[PDB]
Design a protein around this ligand. Structure first.
Ligand SMILES: CCCCCCCCCCCCCCCCCC(=O)OC[C@H](COP(=O)([O-])OCC(O)COP(=O)([O-])OC[C@@H](COC(=O)CCCCCCCCCCCCCCCCC)OC(=O)CCCCCCCCCCCCCCCCC)OC(=O)CCCCCCCCCCCCCCCCC
Ligand SMILES: CCCCCCCCCCCCCCCCCC(=O)OC[C@H](COP(=O)(O)OCCN)OC(=O)CCCCCCCCCCCCCCCCC
Ligand SMILES: NC(=O)C1=CN([C@@H]2O[C@H](COP(=O)(O)OP(=O)(O)OC[C@H]3O[C@@H](n4cnc5c(N)ncnc54)[C@H](OP(=O)(O)O)[C@@H]3O)[C@@H](O)[C@H]2O)C=CC1
Ligand code: SF4
Ligand code: SF4
Ligand code: SF4
Ligand SMILES: [Zn+2]
Lengths: 314, 387, 208, 95, 114, 57, 176, 56, 155, 144
């Protein structure tokens, strides 16, 4: 054994597969799914967790035995992150709230934490480090978190040059914070957005496509040192989304223009970057999965739901 | 159209095992009930084929867990019968003793849990205290609480610890008083009675075709017993008498279980009086292991030890069906032996697997609220039914 | 032979031999082989036709009753031109006796509806279907007992390994229990316990 | 006071020590690696060499009915110490 | 070679009965996929049904055909009713089976003699 | 009865998964374990399968 | 013999049916009998405080799987594989490499307490009584990992208490 | 039982006669533990000169 | 300083919430009987405040006892899946805790981890009622150190 | 008339056992408050009490006290706090306490008998024994 060298048997549930890794965050959503694929293919996992002992139990069933091992840490001091990644095939980063809390700010959450964990990543002598951020991270203003995190990718690429720095677009799934938010914003006052109308082009991407993107990126060579993004394959919707996802599924602490300007951010940005198939994985249109996650209503009639089919100028 | 389809429920607070059920009914009345069994099925009979006789025996312990030493007695009698061996007398007597003790267990459970299901929170408590005394006996005997075997082919091993029969006597002394306390707790209660009187009756010949064997045939006409007719061990000798009932009414079956508890006290008593001090295991070194004193210091004892554990004794080929009286009724294993160490194919017979198939007819005439009592009345364990 | 050995009786032996012989005289059509175990349990072999006639008989005739069906089962034996032995095991209520009825079938050849004699045969037959796959002609119902609804493959038959071909687990992807090709943490270590020397000289077969 | 790896792991009476490369070592982070602090072999040389003025002797290994089964060991060759096959405690014939 | 055929003497009536069965399924696909609240489009489900028929299409002996038909009407007899939860009806679909490489040098590249 | 005489090779699709295509089955009479002398292990044909990989958990 | 119940003649004669209208009507049997036999309440209940008190047990009781060693500990286990051979759950593992001294012990001796049914067979089969079911039931691990025992954990279990097990074995070896 | 006055009269007056073996089993009759150490017999065979394994 | 209030209130909602913890008894197989003996008078549950009541909605925590077959498993996870969000799973018996005396054949699921996450594994076959009880107590002592709220205070 | 004996039982046990604060102490400690029964051979911090034999099943009882293994505190009471021999004699295993019949006092037994290691940084983690398997080959460091 050199580095986890010899996978065994049909992948998953005690099949060794290839990797060890680690996942920061993972206490909710995208990390949860990602670990579900890593353990689902049998690899060992290390999930460092916040001081909450209880809420991580939901992640237990997906690790078989002797895998998904837990340890305490906090992003402030080196030695914890140092201790977590000592033995790893790779390491990947998922971090940060969509709002600011007390001690933490939008700065240092996408800034200092990647600085540290990437620094000790290089010092630990580990390869294939994956780092993520939001799509259309730009030095230009109108989104605090976004200019910040853009500087995040700046330093993440400055130190530890070789790594996959990958921007998904608005990520879409079961427990996610985006489309569910639109479903829950319909309440009193009816003023979520469309203040000036239009002006918003957006292409949400369904989650399993993203996480499969990460797992191919992690186990496929020539995914290192190449930055690229994810794209909702077809939809590329206007605000007609809001009235769509509001139409289907019918009808029954946050933050300011940080949040509403966040969701109001508009761009698909730059065409030339390896999109999806350049990483070799299929893409999912919105419809079916949207039904799945939405549920609700009275459930008794399948009906049609009249797909939006914005595809403006597409 | 009308009717319905309703379903089971996951547990009552005492629930032993879970069934589903689908009852096509009329307004608060069940026209058709179709129990779905097989919910808890652990696939024992496929496992036994892979493990030698001495190994597969705990399966015959825990296939029906409530009554245990009885099932032990069934499988052991099967291997002895097919293997041409007799256990020494004292082994037979001990086996009888704990047989009827175990019968006292499964009966007191069936009755009490039948109460707790229906209502009547307390009798469960009063009597399962005494049941805890019973397991206090097992823990001395076999060195564990419930599933500990303490039964082999060719006789039991590890005879009673010195001073056990005193405790046995002491419990058996006043158990009569306490069970009579239950008989005042019930039996002339207008509630319990007036809930179960005519519910789920059976015609004798009908019970024969449906193959019910147990307190069923007892309480409904058709006087029959395996204990009396086909004595399988020294259990022949001791005197006692079985009850019956003429109403076939499911109340008779209750009272018959009771009187079988009392008679079980008689059998326990006489057994304590008759106990010969012969020995535990048979003396044939190749059927059953030697005790350690002979094991060490003596060569052939060592060999028969070592092989009798690794390979295990070989049983000549033959097909046997043995049947005993177990507190749920007639229980039996059909052994099929290639001349070998391992068994080959052995299908146990679960009385619950028969009795359960009868709910179709038995429950045809009473609404579901008493379909509760219809299921609970015939002693049944869904761990034994499935297998 | 006095201690340690079961004393055997020749009374029940002669009686049961007489009775089986009798059955052979009265039913020449279906009867093939009538034997008595040396521990005295009569066992009758029957062609896979007269199961209905033979059992209709053994329930009646007033010189035999067998009102109660003890247990219905089967044994999966490869090496035979017919894989299975359907074993009817009966209980005589009046006379204190039990006799067995063996019949055979392959996979495709059905055995026809023993229900019409004994109601107790109702579930035993279904359980046989699910766990083996012997089909039963015009049974009032056929369903799955003891196995999962979507399950397949008739487990008890030796073609089916100890473990299954599937497992269950749960994952936050689909929010439902799923199935994956069986993967054991431990190999299920296999043992060869069968020793040479033919411990039993009697049952030996002629070599060829 | 067991021989300790350069990593700090305590090797065992059958040396299991992991290699610095092996990822599996991470399972000991934050939790103790358990090993019996008292080796077996170290207690064999602890024992004196028993001597018997007879030619052929027995070992019950701690008394009757508790211990290993009897075996008679041959002390004829005195250029080595005849050892029990169960206990491991040597014997010699005195001179 | 003797035999006791079951519901049909020749492959003709076999083909007849399997046509019947496929009619039944094609009836009750929408009612089920709506009934357990599956996420599959009726078209897709039907396609998997006809697929599962096509998998066995190479059989000849009408005993075997008839027996398979008994299997079919049995499982359909369980899905027409509620006896089978969302789980198994999904379990026909394989979402959580990882895609198995069927091309050689990919198989060789990993599986070492599957 | 109308026995319906029929001639074709018997095959079974009512049994497990795609393992049928890949694996070859072996028939033999196991040769006596040499370190013992006796034949009762022999005399009965057996069927075992091509083995497959195993790893250290 | 048959002794049967409920076959009786209810008397429709007077002085029986008096107490039948009294019985149905006034609930005397119900009230008196039941309410009073519960008013049997006052007997001191049987309850035991488990942290501070413990129920009875037996010298043959079966706890957890401690390995034993001789005086001047030799690792009493010879490696002879029996305890693994008779394990009805198959859960044991033994791999034995002859060590420096030439005597044979086990490299990896493992148990899955999950799989383990707590037979007692491995306690009977051991020729030297190396492994014995402990007196102590001490359990409730927080992970499925922790219930799998190395040879090492079984040793340390044996060192934690022996004179315990020595008292039990010394008591009951006459029975076995 | 524990010292009981007028409540044991209540119990004597409800459910009838009692006080033989209080339901709780807590009063003596515990056998001590094995005053003698056990010594067990051995049945037929276990004897030279009588037997050859063929007969028995 | 309010962190004193934080820790104190933690010991309040925690103190009570653990002091009661009345679960539901799933009770598949012969471990269920032993559990009932924990509910018997001798070993009685009630002293510790644990109450016996049956419904997954009222259920504080769940005891998986008995052998878990493939056929039962989905229903089990549903019973888990309509439950008060704070919840805990105690695996009783050698079977459910990793497969026990079967662990093989097919119909039985191996461990109850493969279905729902688990907290207290109590071995035994059956675990002696005392042992099961010790498992519940140790679960309480896992409830003590939850320290759940002051990390919601994010310090 | 009779009740005075009862209130003298309670008054006696609370008076002699623990004193003024002792009744509250033992009461909240263990909700079972018993008459002081003999001594019970203290050994470690935990003190033992063997009843006069007044009744079975609740024969004997214990207070675990505090500080065991220089770890935890009181209020943590559970099993395994008893050492091995008191585990034997407390469970009815044997009717003879450890001081009257002493243990064999072997040299290699633990002198601590520490707590219960579940949880905490001190915890048992299972792992593979033996030694590697196949001893992979290595290339020579000298080119050509
Ligand atoms: C708190 C501490 C409890 C404690 O340790 O008590 C043990 C201690 C004696 O325990 P013990 O050594 O086992 O002796 C008592 C017998 O074992 C067992 O005692 P007993 O049950 O044999 O004696 C019963 C006696 C003792 O009862 C009382 O002392 C309570 C009534 C008088 C209160 C003054 O009852 C009476 O004198 C009155 C009987 C009334 C019958 C009808 C009741 C109807 C209503 C039911 C509700 O209890 C007392 O001394 C009782 C003191 C508390 C009485 C109640 C005070 C509040 C009102
Ligand atoms: C001289 C001038 C004229 C004077 C005239 C005086 C005439 C007096 C004649 C008697 C007066 C009435 C006596 C009480 C009658 C009450 C109603 C009754 O009789 O109920 C009985 C009834 C019978 O049940 P069952 O046999 O199923 O029904 C027959 C239907 N064919 O139902 C039952 O038996 C079942 C009821 C069970 C209820 C549950 C159990 C209750 C237990 C506690 C009850 C006692 C509570 C006492 C009060 C507490 C303090 C307030
Ligand atoms: N809509 C979206 O959310 C989109 C997100 N992304 C990117 O994907 C990433 C992952 O998304 P998602 O799964 O929703 O992330 P989550 O916010 O749901 O999960 C991250 C976890 O890490 C914890 N965490 C890590 N560092 C800190 C810290 N310093 N302070 C507090 N908590 C911390 C969080 O809180 P706790 O400490 O309590 O565990 C949480 O448990 C995002 O960070 C973003 O870069 C991209 C596009 C869209
Ligand atoms: S008690 Fe446990 S280790 Fe011993 S034989 Fe039984 S299952 Fe195996
Ligand atoms: S039976 Fe005893 S000596 Fe033999 S391998 Fe097992 S523990 Fe070791
Ligand atoms: S662990 Fe043992 S007692 Fe519990 S359910 Fe399984 S077989 Fe029964
Ligand atoms: Zn020796």
């Amino acid at each position: 054994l050199h580095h986890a060298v010899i996978p065994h048997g049909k992948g998953g549930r005690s099949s060794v597969s290839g990797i060890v890794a680690t996942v920061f965050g993972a206490t909710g959503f995208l990390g949860r799914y990602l670990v579900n694929h890593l353990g689902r293919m049998g690899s060992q996992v290390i999930v460092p967790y916040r001081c909450e002992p209880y809420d991580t139990m939901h992640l237990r069933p997906m690790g078989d035995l002797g895998q998904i091992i837990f340890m305490d840490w906090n992003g402030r001091d080196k030695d914890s992150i140092r201790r977590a990644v000592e033995h790893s095939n790779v390491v990947i980063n998922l971090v940060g709230r969509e709002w600011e809390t007390k001690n933490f700010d939008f700065e240092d959450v996408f800034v200092k934490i990647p600085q540290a964990i990437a620094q000790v990543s290089k010092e630990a002598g580990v390869e294939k480090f994956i780092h993520i951020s939001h799509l259309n991270a730009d030095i230009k203003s109108s989104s605090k978190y976004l200019r910040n995190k853009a500087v995040g990718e700046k330093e993440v690429r400055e130190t530890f040059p070789e790594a996959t720095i990958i921007k998904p677009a608005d990520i879409f799934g079961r427990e996610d914070r985006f489309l569910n938010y639109f479903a829950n914003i319909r309440w009193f006052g009816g003023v979520p957005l469309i203040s000036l109308g239009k002006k918003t082009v957006k292409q949400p991407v369904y989650i399993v496509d993203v996480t499969k993107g990460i797992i191919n990126a992690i186990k496929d060579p020539d995914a290192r040192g190449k930055t690229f993004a994810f794209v909702g394959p077809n939809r590329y919707l206007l605000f007609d989304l809001v009235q769509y996802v509001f139409a289907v599924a019918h009808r029954p602490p946050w933050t300011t223009r940080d949040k509403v300007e966040r969701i109001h951010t508009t761009d698909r940005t730059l065409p030339h970057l390896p999109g999806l198939e350049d990483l070799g994985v299929q893409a999912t249109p919105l419809e079916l999965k949207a039904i799945e996650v939405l549920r609700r209503h009275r459930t008794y009639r399948w009906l049609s739901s009249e797909i939006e089919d914005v595809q403006p100028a597409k | 159209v009308s009717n319905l389809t309703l379903n089971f429920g996951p547990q009552h607070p005492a629930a032993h095992g879970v069934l589903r059920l689908v009852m096509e009914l009329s307004g608060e009345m069940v026209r058709k009930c179709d129990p779905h069994i097989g919910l808890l099925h652990r696939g024992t009979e496929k496992l036994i084929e892979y493990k030698t006789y001495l190994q597969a025996l705990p399966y015959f312990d825990r296939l029906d867990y409530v009554s245990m030493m009885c099932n032990e007695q069934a499988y052991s009698l099967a291997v002895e019968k097919l293997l041409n061996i007799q256990p020494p007398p004292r082994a037979q007597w001990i086996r009888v003793l704990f047989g009827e003790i175990t019968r006292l267990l499964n009966h007191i459970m069936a009755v009490t849990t039948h109460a707790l299901d229906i209502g009547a929170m307390t009798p469960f408590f009063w009597m399962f205290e005494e049941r805890e005394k019973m397991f206090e006996f097992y823990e001395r005997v076999s060195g564990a609480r419930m599933h500990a075997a303490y039964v082999r082919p060719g006789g039991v091993h590890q005879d009673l610890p010195l001073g056990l029969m005193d405790d046995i006597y002491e419990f058996s002394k006043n158990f009569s008083l306490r069970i009579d306390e239950l008989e005042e707790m019930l039996t002339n209660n207008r509630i319990w009675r007036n809930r179960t009187v005519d519910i789920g009756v059976v015609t004798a010949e009908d019970a024969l075709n449906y193959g019910f064997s147990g307190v069923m045939l007892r309480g409904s006409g058709i006087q029959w017993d395996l204990r009396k007719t086909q004595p399988y061990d020294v259990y022949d000798q001791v005197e006692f008498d079985v009850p019956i009932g003429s109403r076939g009414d499911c109340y008779d079956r209750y009272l018959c279980r009771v009187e079988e508890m009392r008679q079980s006290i008689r059998i326990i008593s006489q057994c304590l009086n008759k106990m010969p001090p012969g020995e535990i295991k048979v003396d044939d070194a190749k059927v059953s292991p030697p005790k350690r004193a002979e094991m060490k210091t003596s060569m052939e004892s060592l060999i028969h030890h070592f092989k009798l554990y690794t390979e295990g004794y070989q049983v000549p080929p033959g097909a046997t069906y043995t049947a005993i009286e177990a507190p749920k009724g007639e229980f039996g294993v059909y052994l099929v032996s290639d001349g070998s160490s391992r068994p080959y194919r052995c299908k146990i017979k679960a009385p619950g697997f028969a009795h359960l198939a009868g709910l179709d007819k038995m429950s045809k005439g009473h609404m579901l609220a008493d379909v509760v009592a219809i299921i609970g009345t015939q002693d049944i364990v869904f761990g034994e039914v499935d297998r | 032979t006095r201690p340690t050995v079961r004393p055997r009786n020749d009374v029940a032996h002669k009686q049961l031999s007489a009775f089986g012989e009798y059955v052979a005289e009265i039913l020449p059509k279906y009867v093939q082989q009538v034997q008595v175990s040396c521990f005295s349990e009569l066992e009758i072999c029957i062609h896979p036709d007269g199961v209905i006639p033979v059992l209709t008989f053994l329930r009646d005739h007033s010189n035999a009753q067998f009102k109660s069906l003890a247990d219905l089962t089967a044994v999966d034996i490869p090496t035979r031109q017919n894989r299975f032995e359907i074993v009817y095991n009966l209980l005589s209520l009046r006379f204190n006796s039990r006799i067995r009825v063996k019949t055979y079938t392959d996979e495709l050849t059905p055995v026809e509806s023993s229900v019409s004699v004994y109601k107790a045969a109702n579930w035993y037959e279904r359980e046989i279907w699910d766990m083996f796959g012997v089909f039963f002609a015009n049974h009032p119902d056929l369903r799955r007992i003891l196995t999962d609804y979507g399950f397949e493959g008739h487990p008890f038959r030796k073609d089916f390994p100890l473990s299954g071909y599937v497992e269950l687990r749960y994952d936050d992807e689909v929010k439902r229990v799923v199935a994956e090709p069986v993967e054991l943490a431990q190999e299920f270590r296999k043992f060869d316990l069968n020793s040479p020397w033919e411990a039993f000289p009697a049952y030996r077969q002629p070599p060829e | 006071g067991v021989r300790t790896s350069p990593t700090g792991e305590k090797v065992t009476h059958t040396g299991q020590v992991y290699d610095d490369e092996d990822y599996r070592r991470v399972r000991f982070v934050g939790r103790q690696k358990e090993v019996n602090e008292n080796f077996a072999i170290d207690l064999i040389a602890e024992q004196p060499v028993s001597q018997v003025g007879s030619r052929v002797i027995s070992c019950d290994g701690g008394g009757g009915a508790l211990g290993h089964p009897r075996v008679y060991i041959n002390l004829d060759k005195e250029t080595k110490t005849g050892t029990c096959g169960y206990c491991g405690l040597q014997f010699r014939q005195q001179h | 070679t003797s035999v006791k055929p079951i519901f049909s003497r020749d492959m003709n009536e076999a083909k007849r009965r399997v046509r019947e069965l496929y009619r039944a399924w094609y009836r009750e696909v929408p009612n089920t996929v709506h009934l357990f609240q599956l996420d599959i489009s009726v078209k897709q489900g039907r396609d998997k049904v006809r697929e599962m028929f096509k998998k066995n299409a190479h059989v000849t002996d009408p005993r075997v055909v008839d027996l398979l038909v008994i299997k079919g009407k049995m499982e359909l007899e369980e899905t027409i009713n509620v006896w089978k939860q969302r789980t198994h009806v999904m379990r026909f679909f394989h979402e959580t089976e990882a895609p198995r490489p069927k091309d050689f040098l990919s198989k060789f590249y990993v599986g070492h003699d599957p | 009865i109308t026995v319906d005489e029929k001639l074709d090779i018997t095959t079974l699709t009512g049994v497990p998964e795609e393992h049928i295509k890949t694996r070859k089955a072996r028939i033999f009479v196991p040769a006596r374990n040499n370190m013992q002398s006796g034949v009762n292990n022999t005399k009965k044909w057996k069927m075992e399968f091509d083995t497959r990989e195993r790893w250290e958990n | 013999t048959y002794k049967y119940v409920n076959l009786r003649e209810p008397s429709m004669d007077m002085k029986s049916v008096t107490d039948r209208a009294a019985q149905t009507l006034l609930w005397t049997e119900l009230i008196r009998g039941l309410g009073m036999t519960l008013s049997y309440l006052f007997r001191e209940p049987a309850t035991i405080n488990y942290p501070f008190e413990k129920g009875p047990l037996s010298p043959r009781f079966r706890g957890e799987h401690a390995l034993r060693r001789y005086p001047s500990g030799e690792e009493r286990c010879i490696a002879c594989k029996l305890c693994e051979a008779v394990c009805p759950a198959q859960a044991i593992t033994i791999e034995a490499e002859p060590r420096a001294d030439g005597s044979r012990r086990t490299t990896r001796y493992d148990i899955d307490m999950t799989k383990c049914i707590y037979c007692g067979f491995c306690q009977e089969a051991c020729p030297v009584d190396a492994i014995v079911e402990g007196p102590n039931f001490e359990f409730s691990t927080e992970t499925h990992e922790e219930l799998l025992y190395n040879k090492e954990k079984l040793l340390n279990n044996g060192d934690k208490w022996e004179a315990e097990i020595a008292a039990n074995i010394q008591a009951d070896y006459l029975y076995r | 039982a524990s010292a009981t006055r007028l409540i044991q009269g209540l119990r004597n007056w409800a459910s009838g006669r009692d006080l033989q073996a209080k339901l709780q089993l807590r009063y003596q009759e515990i056998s001590k533990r094995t005053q003698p150490p056990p010594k067990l017999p051995v049945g037929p065979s276990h004897r030279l000169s009588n037997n050859y394994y063929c007969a028995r | 300083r309010g962190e004193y209030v934080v820790a104190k209130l933690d010991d309040l909602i925690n103190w009570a919430r653990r002091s009661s913890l009345w679960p539901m008894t799933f009770g598949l197989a012969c471990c269920a009987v032993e559990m009932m003996h924990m509910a018997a008078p001798r070993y009685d549950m009630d002293r510790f405040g644990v109450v016996f009541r049956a419904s997954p909605r009222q259920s504080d925590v769940m005891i998986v006892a008995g052998t878990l077959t493939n056929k039962m498993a989905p229903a089990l996870r549903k019973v888990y899946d309509q439950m008060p969000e704070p919840r805990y799973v105690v695996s009783m018996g050698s079977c459910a805790n990793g497969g026990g005396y079967y662990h093989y054949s097919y119909s039985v699921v191996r461990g109850c981890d493969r279905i729902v996450p688990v907290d207290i594994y109590v071995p035994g076959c059956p675990p002696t009622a005392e042992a099961l009880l010790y498992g519940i107590l140790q679960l309480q002592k896992k409830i003590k150190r939850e320290k759940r709220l002051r990390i919601w205070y994010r310090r | 008339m009779e009740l005075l004996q009862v209130l003298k039982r309670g008054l006696q046990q609370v008076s002699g056992h623990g004193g003024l604060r002792g009744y509250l102490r033992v009461l909240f400690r263990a909700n079972d408050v018993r008459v002081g029964t003999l001594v019970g051979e203290d050994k470690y911090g935990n003190k033992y009490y063997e009843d006069n034999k007044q009744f079975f099943g609740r024969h004997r009882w214990v207070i675990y006290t505090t500080e065991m293994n220089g770890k935890n505190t009181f209020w943590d009471v559970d099993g395994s706090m008893v050492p091995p021999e008191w585990h034997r004699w407390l469970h009815c295993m044997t009717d003879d306490p450890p001081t009257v019949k002493p243990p064999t006092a072997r040299k290699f037994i633990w002198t601590n008998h520490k707590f219960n290691l579940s949880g905490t940084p001190q915890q048992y983690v299972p792992y593979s024994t033996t030694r590697k398997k196949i001893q992979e080959w290595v290339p020579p460091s000298t080119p050509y």
